[PDB]
Amino acid sequence: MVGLIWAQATSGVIGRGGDIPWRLPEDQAHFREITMGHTIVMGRRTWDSLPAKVRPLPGRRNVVLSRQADFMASGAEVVGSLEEALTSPETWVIGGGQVYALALPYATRCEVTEVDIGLPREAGDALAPVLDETWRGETGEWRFSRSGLRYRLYSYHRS
Ligand SMILES: NC(=O)c1ccc[n+]([C@@H]2O[C@H](COP(=O)([O-])OP(=O)(O)OC[C@H]3O[C@@H](n4cnc5c(N)ncnc54)[C@H](OP(=O)(O)O)[C@@H]3O)[C@@H](O)[C@H]2O)c1
Numbered sequence: 001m002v003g004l005i006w007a008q009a010t011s012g013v014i015g016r017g018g019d020i021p022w023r024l025p026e027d028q029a030h031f032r033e034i035t036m037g038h039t040i041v042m043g044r045r046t047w048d049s050l051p052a053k054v055r056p057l058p059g060r061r062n063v064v065l066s067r068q069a070d071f072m073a074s075g076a077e078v079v080g081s082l083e084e085a086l087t088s089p090e091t092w093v094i095g096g097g098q099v100y101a102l103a104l105p106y107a108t109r110c111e112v113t114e115v116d117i118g119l120p121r122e123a124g125d126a127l128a129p130v131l132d133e134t135w136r137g138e139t140g141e142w143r144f145s146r147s148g149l150r151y152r153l154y155s156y157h158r159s
């Protein structure tokens with residue numbers, strides 16, 4: 001099982017300036033629940049976006065995808081191809097935009113948090129992957145984050 005997990009604005013923006021223009025504690029909790037105990041695969045830029053304090057993410061096989069053969073990710077596994085990272089029953093790809101696009105053919109699940117924020121796309125933004133017609137989704141109920149933004153969960157799946 002390869003799954004993708006991300007949060008996006010209604011515009012599809014997932015990242016800007018190397019970070020994320022929101023923070024939902026409820027989404028972080030759902031992220032930890034979904035990924036705990038499994039392999040997480042992330043691009044080098046996303047590993048850069050994690051503070052040194054919190055990486056590697058606890059209780060998970062942290063894998064970083066990089067073309068730099070000498071890149072050091074303390075506490076993580078650095079691989080040069082995505083296939084190297086899929087040696088486990090459950091692999092969760094956790095960002096960023098490049099690695100989502102790279103991993104989509106392998107994926108049968110997308111856990112998508114839609115954040116009700118009006119965020120026009122800018123040059124340089126990281127964007128969520130386009131899901132074609134093979135994907136079957138369950139649109140969720142709008143929820144209120146204590147951060148003040150409304151959010152909902154899409155759980156997409158395909159055979
Ligand atoms: N849920 C969310 O909203 C969410 C989740 C995660 C991240 N983000 C955001 O997404 C943004 C970063 O995403 P990104 O698209 O800019 O960069 P990224 O996808 O996180 O990582 C890109 C890097 O991955 C490596 N890479 C990419 N394709 C590769 C391939 N085919 N083979 C080997 N290595 C490859 C390269 O690392 P080298 O350059 O070292 O080779 C490339 O620079 C940040 O703003 C982050 O905060 C958002």
Ligand SMILES: O=C(O)c1cccc(CSc2cccs2)c1
Pocket residue numbers: 046049050051054094095
């Ligand atoms: O654990 C924390 O305290 C913490 C606070 C802020 C941000 C993060 C990164 S989790 C993530 C970011 C992109 C893909 S997965 C972690």
Ligand SMILES: [Co+2]
Pocket residue numbers: 033034035036037038
């Ligand atoms: Co699990």
